Design a protein around this ligand. Sequence first.
Ligand SMILES: Cc1c(N)cccc1C(=O)N[C@H](C)c1cccc2ccccc12
Ligand SMILES: [Cl-]
Ligand SMILES: [Cl-]
Ligand SMILES: [Cl-]
Ligand SMILES: [Cl-]
Ligand SMILES: [Zn+2]
Ligand SMILES: [Zn+2]
Ligand SMILES: [Zn+2]
Ligand SMILES: [Zn+2]
Length: 312
Amino acid sequence: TIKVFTTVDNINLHTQVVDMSMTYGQQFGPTYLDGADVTKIKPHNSHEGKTFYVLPNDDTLRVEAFEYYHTTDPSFLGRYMSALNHTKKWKYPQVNGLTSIKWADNNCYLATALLTLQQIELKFNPPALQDAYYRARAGEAANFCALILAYCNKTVGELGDVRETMSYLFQHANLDSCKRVLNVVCKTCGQQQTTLKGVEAVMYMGTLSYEQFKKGVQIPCTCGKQATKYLVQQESPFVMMSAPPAQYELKHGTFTCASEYTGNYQCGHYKHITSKETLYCIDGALLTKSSEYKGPITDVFYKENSYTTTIK
Ligand SMILES: Cc1c(N)cccc1C(=O)N[C@H](C)c1cccc2ccccc12
Ligand SMILES: [Cl-]
Ligand SMILES: [Cl-]
Ligand SMILES: [Cl-]
Ligand SMILES: [Cl-]
Ligand SMILES: [Zn+2]
Ligand SMILES: [Zn+2]
Ligand SMILES: [Zn+2]
Ligand SMILES: [Zn+2]
């Protein structure tokens, strides 16, 4: 009868004395080792004193699991562990000082997201995500990638979108201070100012150009006509500007990083462009550099702190 530890968070460990003549499943319910489902398996001898993840089956474990993951979804742990079983076999090469991912299991959108997350200021609310984000920044990204899959409700090999992935992660981040003030000018209706907070204050869909957003973009007015929307005030450490992919020129020093998407809707591949002392293009493990870039861009990230318009 070996001594093991059970946990939902790998911080609070609970000593258990297990029966060597019963499965982990019979004694604990769903039980995992480093991602590997061992519910239907007897305790070996080299399992002695090791840490097992369990599905929460008492109040203490349910509270610990919510405090760590910020979800009570009973499927979360099994989806996280199933993802981790693959993400632990991925390769996380250091490319131009950034942790990337070698191509596997349609993971280009995760590699692009992971590269982006290393270049923008973001604090995650769930300790599971914040802890794994620090570990990923230091080169140990397998756990973080499995969490991103579980929080986005995506499995390994499923096709993914960087913008949708960033949106889910931002909904799990402290963006409460982020504020965006917009003005809409219609010939007829006149001027209406609106204030957005959190995720809606940092994401925009319809133009890649932060400068064009400051000048004004044409949107339909509920009245019928076309109106100009422009940015009045921005308080955030970054903005994400997205549009359906189109040929776009990226200028060294005018943006932080960008998502390149080649191919048809739900049938293409991401590469990541980052502005350093020159432009670096990261394609999983592969790196190329050039002074200029023109290609199909769908996301551009920019630095911000505080912007106020000069438009009266
Ligand atoms: C949306 C999506 C999902 N859900 C999953 C995987 C890929 C994409 C996608 O095509 N995204 C790209 C960036 C994209 C997003 C939006 C519009 C697009 C139009 C033409 C071609 C690609 C477009
Ligand atoms: Cl625990
Ligand atoms: Cl929450
Ligand atoms: Cl891929
Ligand atoms: Cl959260
Ligand atoms: Zn939360
Ligand atoms: Zn795999
Ligand atoms: Zn109008
Ligand atoms: Zn791909």
